[PDB]
Amino acid sequence: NEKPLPEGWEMRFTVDGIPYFVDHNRRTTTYIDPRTGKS
Amino acid sequence: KPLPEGWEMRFTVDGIPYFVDHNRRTTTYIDPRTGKS
Amino acid sequence: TPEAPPCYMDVI
Amino acid sequence: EAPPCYMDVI
């Protein structure tokens, strides 16, 4: 996916390599990519 | 007003409401009905 | 510190 | 499983 992450969001990986997404406005984390709405 | 599907309201030890999202398995103080804490 | 509520893993 | 806790991340 070439799109940037939207404002407030950061991507990290779990130890076992799963992408997850951190929302620093709402203080949430999720496997849902904020660019796609899917995990 | 009802929360979105999969969401629940809980309360902290000091009685502050917060929102539990069982679809994504996360929590926030920001009410998803309004976008404010 | 920001205000963040209890974590899902801790309360579920 | 659930995604990592916010306060663990920061």
**Structure-determination approach:** X-ray
What is the least distance, in Å, from the CA of D2 to any CA of chain A? 8
| Distance, CA of D10 to CA of D8 (rounded, Å) | 6
How many C-beta atoms lie closer than 10 Å to residue A28's C-beta?
25
CB nearest A30 (choices: B26, B29, B30): B26
Tally of residues, chain D: 10
| Distance, CA of C9 to CA of B32 (rounded, Å) | 20
CATH code, domain with A12: 2.20.70.10
| Owning domain of residue A21 | 1-39
Structure tokens at C9: 């893993």
For every residue of A1-39, DSSP letters joined together read: --SPPPTTEEEEE-TTS-EEEEETTTTEEESS-TTTS--
Pairing label, strands A9-13, A28-30: unpaired
What is the least distance, in Å, from the CA of B37 to any CA of chain A? 9
For chain C, the C-alpha Rg in angstroms (whole number) is: 8
Count of the separate structural domains present in chain A: 1
- Give buried/exposed letters for C1-12 (b at 16+ CB in 10 A, else e): eeebbbbbeeee
| Distance, CA of B24 to CA of C6 (rounded, Å) | 15
